[PDB]
């Protein structure tokens, strides 16, 4: 019943600089006992949620004082005075004044570090997989920033379509980079009708588009 | 303080499942507890609560008449019996402690994943991503493991039984068109280590009782 609305939903911030997240409830969170039960937690990459703040402004155990909370009624704000790389993740507010418990949608904080070009690696399929009748070729983009990266597969110079998938990590808590894994998958037969397999990487950190390739057979 | 959930897994629509949370590091009988769920790629939704006194319970509208939360103080255990499961109940289910001293929920467990689908269990194939050449001008090699075609989630990957964690990236799984998942896990290591150091990825797919330790060697 009590809707929690956060803004912005995505918050890129330069490290060293402040950040603010807004949390608004559809009804006042002032309880008849005189307390206001508004809380903040953070969910880091690959981790369980951890509480940051309870009762509007109270710091939980171990939480650095660059975090602060304020507000009243229906209007609340989490502030980080100087954002650190370790602050990356998704922030949620939630109210404990009204039954049932409701959370905000979440605000993903992104750290805007310096541009980093990806290290590109190509991996031919294993003989294990080839034995099973299929062929996966992996292209790895390691530790880059920002997140926008274009990856295209070329087999004997022919641009591929509909036979590749990619996955991207969450922004790293320590170096604030991303990594990307692109997998091109073919039948063994199809894979064996060609020689040159190439993945072409385009990224703002690269001086020019980068191609990593190998020739099948001694693949 | 530790909250460890078990019991999650694959179940057909209309099916039943029983979740457990083993609690330690605090006087369990003194605290209210709740289950809260997170559908992958989405937000937090409260599921159920039980007080420390009287075995009094509370349920979100979505699960009324289907879920039963309970506790065994003698076993320091929280339970969630789930009946008439629906696809819409598919989520990571967290055990969560209520801190009455701060008027707010504090500790979250690690979560246990519930998948409601008519799709079949499938174990993964684990393929080596062999470090080739060179790979970099600067003495760094990339190697990894491709964990292909499994269902349901999750799969875990470690390297050398947990000893090797530096420079490890395990990618979020990609849901393929077929309904099956694949992922990769990679690590960058010194090029000079390849001759002497042994690299093994340890893959766990519990829903299929699959346990695989795969040695990754160059060439």
């Amino acid at each position: 019943y009590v809707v929690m609305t956060q803004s912005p939903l995505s918050l890129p911030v330069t490290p060293g600089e402040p950040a603010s997240i807004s949390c608004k409830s559809s009804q006042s969170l002032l309880d008849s006992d005189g307390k206001t039960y508004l809380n903040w937690l953070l969910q880091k990459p690959g981790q369980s949620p951890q509480r940051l703040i309870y009762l509007v402004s109270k710091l939980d155990s171990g939480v650095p004082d660059r975090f602060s909370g304020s507000g009243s009624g229906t209007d609340f704000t989490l502030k980080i005075s100087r954002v650190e790389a370790e602050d990356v993740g998704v922030y949620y507010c939630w109210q404990g004044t009204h039954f049932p418990r409701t959370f905000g949608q979440g605000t993903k904080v992104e750290i805007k570090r310096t541009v980093a070009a990806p290290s590109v690696f190509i991996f031919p399929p294993s003989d294990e997989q080839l034995k099973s009748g299929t062929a996966s070729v992996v292209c790895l983009l390691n530790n880059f920033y920002p997140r926008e990266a274009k990856v295209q597969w070329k087999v004997d110079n022919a641009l591929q379509s509909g036979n590749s998938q990619e996955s991207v990590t969450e922004q790293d808590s320590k170096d604030s980079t991303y990594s990307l894994s692109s997998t091109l998958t073919l039948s063994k037969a199809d894979y064996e009708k060609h020689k040159v397999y190439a993945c072409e990487v385009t990224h703002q950190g690269l001086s020019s588009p980068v191609t990593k390739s190998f020739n099948r057979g001694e693949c | 303080v530790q909250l460890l959930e078990s019991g999650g897994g694959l179940v057909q629509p209309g099916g039943s499942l029983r979740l457990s949370c083993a609690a330690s590091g605090f006087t369990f009988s003194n605290y209210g507890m709740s289950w809260v769920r997170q559908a992958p790629g989405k937000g937090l939704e409260w599921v159920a609560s039980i007080r420390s006194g009287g075995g009094r319970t509370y349920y979100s509208d979505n699960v009324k008449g289907r879920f039963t939360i309970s506790r065994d103080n003698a076993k320091n255990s929280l339970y969630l019996q789930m009946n008439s499961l629906r696809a819409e109940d598919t989520a990571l289910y967290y055990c969560v402690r209520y801190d009455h001293y701060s008027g707010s929920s504090d500790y979250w467990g690690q979560g246990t994943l519930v998948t409601v689908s008519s799709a079949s269990t499938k174990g993964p194939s684990v393929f080596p991503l062999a470090p080739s050449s060179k790979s970099t001008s600067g003495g760094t090699a990339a190697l990894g493991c491709l964990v292909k075609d499994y269902f349901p989630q999750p799969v875990t990957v470690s390297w050398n039984s947990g000893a090797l964690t530096s420079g490890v990236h395990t990618f979020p799984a990609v849901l393929q068109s077929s309904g099956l998942y694949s992922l990769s896990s990679v690590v960058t290591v010194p090029s000079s280590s390849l001759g002497t150091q042994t690299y093994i990825c340890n893959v766990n797919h519990k829903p299929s009782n699959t346990k695989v330790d795969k040695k990754v060697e160059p060439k």
């Binding site: 309880d31 006992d33 039960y37 809380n39 939630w94 109210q95 404990g96 004044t97 009204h98 039954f99 049932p100 418990r101 | 209210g32 609560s49 007080r51 509370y58 209520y98 009455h100 008027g103 707010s104 929920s105």
Partner: peptide, 6 residues
């Protein structure tokens, strides 16, 4: 959370 009070 409110369910634990009142």
């Amino acid at each position: 959370d409110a369910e634990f009070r009142h």
